[PDB]
């Protein structure tokens, strides 16, 4: 029942600011301090310091003096981390974590928030239907797909018939090549069910697009 | 380093696993903590482990996890290690350096569990869509599903001989039981049309499976 839920991924240019949130539930927020831990790609965990959730007083490790601010909204049981004048080397997953518990300092962790510091632009996906050429042979299974091509940054989400089609479905991990992501989802359905009945992939890229594509015979 | 961990370790499924975190002389009798890190999850507190080998385990840690010590060495033991125990294991240690708290995490040990029973991959391939060809582009889709353990290598062939321009994923869904991966070969529409065939070839724990796409087909 102790849960720490962090806000979603951020993509930011050098020089900019970012503020991420960590919402705590399942205990008395003001009873335990909140730590922050950085994990940069290809490095191990680095503790950043912590904030005393009663007194409001933060303590920063020397590496994180100057442009990092821990703050609280204690009424919403939420800790915040703001990083200012973002640097390439700030690219990392940031975790919040709270203590225990017999001088335990990292008993419970958030899931982490990726902050990418980059000049790469946000790029919405091109979505294509992956469909066999006509209705298939009698008494077969048909595999349909959507190709979600060339987007940045992650993630996209995919559903089929608005979530109502789930039995067919496999949504594969994104692949990065050049500066962009590609992903595919597939759904396998009985030859008697499609194309007589409509099947549509629904693709969202939370920067800020939603693409629906009805799969029809090519 | 204050904490030394080898970056990787492997163990036979169902055998005993033993991980070493070595403290430097100045911290040779310190208690350490063990954490488990898996993708898409909060990092997990695993145990506190004393110089004498006494330890307490965290919430939701199965009884197969144990700890012991010898001099500056701290060991995490996993009896009958299971596929779900694949993870990065990280040791940590706190201290006071002038009235100021310091905390130091090891670089982590990535643990793989070998000798698991194998399920061979299922492949699904899609040719370029009509829509994408009209844009003069052709992305060949290879979706790889229902396999265990983790980890496949994939190669594309053009006319039964190999090629490079098409990368893919890391190979996971550590939930369910099986894993998924995919690969995309990014071609022009002229390159698509001007070969007899293309082939997605997947190797999994030394067995390979393959499926082809033919431009003549559509």
User: How many domains does chain A divide into?
Assistant: 2
Cβ atoms of B33 and B91 within 8 Å: the answer is: yes
CA B60 to chain centre: 22
Q: Partners of A25 in the beta sheet?
A: A3
Name the one residue in this structure whose structure tokens are 């927020």. Answer: A29
H/E stretch holding B193 reads helix B189-193
**CATH code of residue A202:** 2.60.40.10
A105 and A127 belong to one structural domain: no
Considering just the CA atoms, what is the radius of gyration of chain B in Å? 24
Asked if B45 and A95 come within 8 Å (Cβ–Cβ), the reply is: no
Considering just the CA atoms, what is the radius of gyration of chain A in Å? 22
Q: Quick check: bond before A155 cis, omega within 30? A: yes
Specify the experimental method. Answer: X-ray
A85 and A152 belong to one structural domain: no
Name the one residue in this structure whose structure tokens are 């608005």. Answer: A162
Phi and psi of A119, rounded to 5°? -90, -5
Q: How far is CA B49 from CA A82, B43, B45, B156, in A?
A: 34, 18, 12, 49
Q: For A100-152, what is the HEC assignment?
A: CCCCCCCCEECCCEEEEECCCCCECCEEEEECCCCCCCCCCEEEEEEEEEEEE
Q: Among A107, A182, A186, whose Cβ lies nearest the Cβ of B45?
A: A107
Q: Largest Cα–Cα distance of chain A, in whole Å?
A: 71
Asked if B129 and A131 come within 8 Å (Cβ–Cβ), the reply is: yes
Residues 6+ apart with CB under 8 A from A16: A86
The angle subtended at Cα A156 by Cα A212 and Cα B40, nearest 5°, is 145
CA distance linking residue A92 with residue A80, whole number of Å:
16
Hey, what are A180's tokens?
A: 């962009």
A89 and A137 belong to one structural domain: no
Closest CA to A70 of A84, A58, A78: A58
Cβ atoms of B17 and B112 within 8 Å: the answer is: no
Single residue among A89, A119, A149 that ends a domain in this structure? A119
A96 and A32 belong to one structural domain: yes
Residue A212 belongs to domain spanning: 120-218
A109 and A125 belong to one structural domain: no
Could you give the count of Cα atoms lying within 13 Å of B146 in the half-sphere of its Cβ? 8
The angle subtended at Cα A125 by Cα A195 and Cα A168, nearest 5°, is 35
CA distance linking residue A193 with residue A142, whole number of Å:
9
Residues in A closer than 8 angstroms to B186, CB to CB, are: 177
Name the one residue in this structure whose structure tokens are 């033993």. Answer: B18
Hey, what are B60's tokens?
A: 């939701």
Hey, what are B162's tokens?
A: 């190999």
H/E stretch holding A68 reads strand A68-73
Q: Quick check: bond before B149 cis, omega within 30? A: yes
Q: CA of B209, closest CA in chain A: separation in Å?
A: 18
CA distance linking residue A144 with residue B124, whole number of Å:
10
Single residue among A94, A119, A144 that ends a domain in this structure? A119
What DSSP string describes A10-25?
EEE-TT--EEEEEEEE
Q: Quick check: bond before A71 cis, omega within 30? A: no
A66 and A99 belong to one structural domain: yes
A90 and A164 belong to one structural domain: no
Q: Largest Cα–Cα distance of chain B, in whole Å?
A: 75
Closest CA to B71 of B36, B27, B12: B27
CA distance linking residue A92 with residue A45, whole number of Å:
10
Closest CA to A36 of A93, A85, A97: A97
Q: How far is CA A147 from CA B142, B143, B185, in A?
A: 11, 11, 12
Closest CA to A94 of A199, A193, A172, A19: A19
CA distance linking residue A169 with residue B97, whole number of Å:
54
H/E stretch holding B132 reads helix B130-134
A73 and A162 belong to one structural domain: no
Residues in B closer than 8 angstroms to A129, CB to CB, are: 129, 131
CA distance linking residue B27 with residue B35, whole number of Å:
19
Closest CA to B204 of B116, B109, B81: B116
CA distance linking residue A113 with residue A91, whole number of Å:
11
A159 and A211 belong to one structural domain: yes
Kindly provide the b/e burial profile for residues A99-119, where b requires at least 16 CB atoms within 10 angstroms of the residue's own CB. Answer: bebeebbbbbbbbbbbbbbee
Name the one residue in this structure whose structure tokens are 């419970």. Answer: A108
Asked if B186 and A177 come within 8 Å (Cβ–Cβ), the reply is: yes
Q: Partners of A97 in the beta sheet?
A: A35, A109
CA distance linking residue B130 with residue B115, whole number of Å:
44
| Strand, helix or coil for residue A53 | coil
Exposed/middle/buried for B61, CB within 10 Å: 0-12, 13-18, 19+?
A: middle
| Strand, helix or coil for residue A156 | coil
* CB atoms near residue B165 (< 10 Å): 12
Q: Which domains can be identified in chain B, with CATH numbers?
A: 1-115 (2.60.40.10), 116-215 (2.60.40.10)
Cβ atoms of B13 and B83 within 8 Å: the answer is: yes
Question: Is the CB of residue A105 less than 8 Å away from at least one CB of chain B?
Answer: yes
Single residue among A119, A138, A162 that ends a domain in this structure? A119
A59 and A131 belong to one structural domain: no
CA distance linking residue A215 with residue A195, whole number of Å:
8
CA A207 to chain centre: 12
Which residue in A has a C-alpha nearest to residue B126's C-alpha?
A130
Question: Is the CB of residue A184 less than 8 Å away from at least one CB of chain B?
Answer: yes
A103 and A133 belong to one structural domain: no
Kindly provide the b/e burial profile for residues A182-210, where b requires at least 16 CB atoms within 10 angstroms of the residue's own CB. Answer: bbbbbbebebeebbeeebbbbbbbeeeee
Q: How far is CA A117 from CA A10, A89, A91, A94, A174, in A?
A: 8, 8, 5, 13, 20
A86 and A106 belong to one structural domain: yes
């Amino acid at each position: 029942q102790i849960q720490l839920v962090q806000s979603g991924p951020e993509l930011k240019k050098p020089g900019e600011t970012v503020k991420i949130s960590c919402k705590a539930s399942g205990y008395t927020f003001t009873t335990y301090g909140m730590s922050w831990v950085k994990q940069a790609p290809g490095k191990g965990f680095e503790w950043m310091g912590w904030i005393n959730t009663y007194s409001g007083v933060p303590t920063y490790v020397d590496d994180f003096k100057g442009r990092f601010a821990f703050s609280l909204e204690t009424s919403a049981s939420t800790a915040y981390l703001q990083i200012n004048n973002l640097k390439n080397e700030d690219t990392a997953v940031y975790f919040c974590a709270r203590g225990g518990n017999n001088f335990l300092w990292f008993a419970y962790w958030g899931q982490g928030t990726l902050v990418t510091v980059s000049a790469a632009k946000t790029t919405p996906p091109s979505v294509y239907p992956l469909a066999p050429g006509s209705a298939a042979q009698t008494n077969s299974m048909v595999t349909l797909g959507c190709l979600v091509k060339g987007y940045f940054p992650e993630p996209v989400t995919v559903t089929w018939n608005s979530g109502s089609l789930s039995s067919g479905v496999h949504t594969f991990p994104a692949v990065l090549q050049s500066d962009l992501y590609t992903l595919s989802s597939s759904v396998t359905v009985p030859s008697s069910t499609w194309p007589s009945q409509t099947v549509t992939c629904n693709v969202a890229h939370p920067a800020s697009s939603t693409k629906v594509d009805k799969k029809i015979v090519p | 380093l204050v904490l030394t961990q080898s970056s990787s370790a492997s163990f036979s499924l169902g055998a005993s696993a033993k991980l070493t975190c070595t403290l430097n002389s100045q911290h040779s009798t310190y208690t350490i903590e063990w954490y488990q890190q898996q993708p898409l999850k909060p990092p997990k507190y695993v145990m506190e482990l004393k110089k004498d080998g006494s330890h307490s385990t965290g919430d939701g840690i199965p009884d197969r996890f144990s700890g012991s010590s010898s001099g500056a060495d701290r060991y995490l033991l996993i009896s009958n290690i299971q596929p779900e125990d694949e993870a990065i294991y990280i040791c940590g240690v706190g201290d006071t350096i002038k009235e100021q708290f310091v905390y130091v995490f090891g670089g982590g040990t990535k643990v793989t569990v070998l000798g698991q029973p194998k399920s061979t991959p299922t492949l699904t391939v899609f040719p370029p869509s009509s829509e994408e060809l009209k844009e003069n582009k052709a992305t060949l889709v290879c979706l790889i599903s229902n396999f265990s353990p983790s980890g496949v290598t994939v190669a594309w062939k053009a006319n039964g001989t190999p090629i490079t321009q098409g990368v893919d994923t890391s190979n996971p869904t550590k939930k369910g039981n099986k894993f998924m991966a995919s690969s995309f070969l990014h071609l022009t529409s002229d390159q698509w049309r001007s070969h007899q065939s293309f082939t997605c070839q997947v190797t999994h724990e030394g067995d390979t499976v393959e499926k082809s796409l033919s431009p003549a087909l559509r």
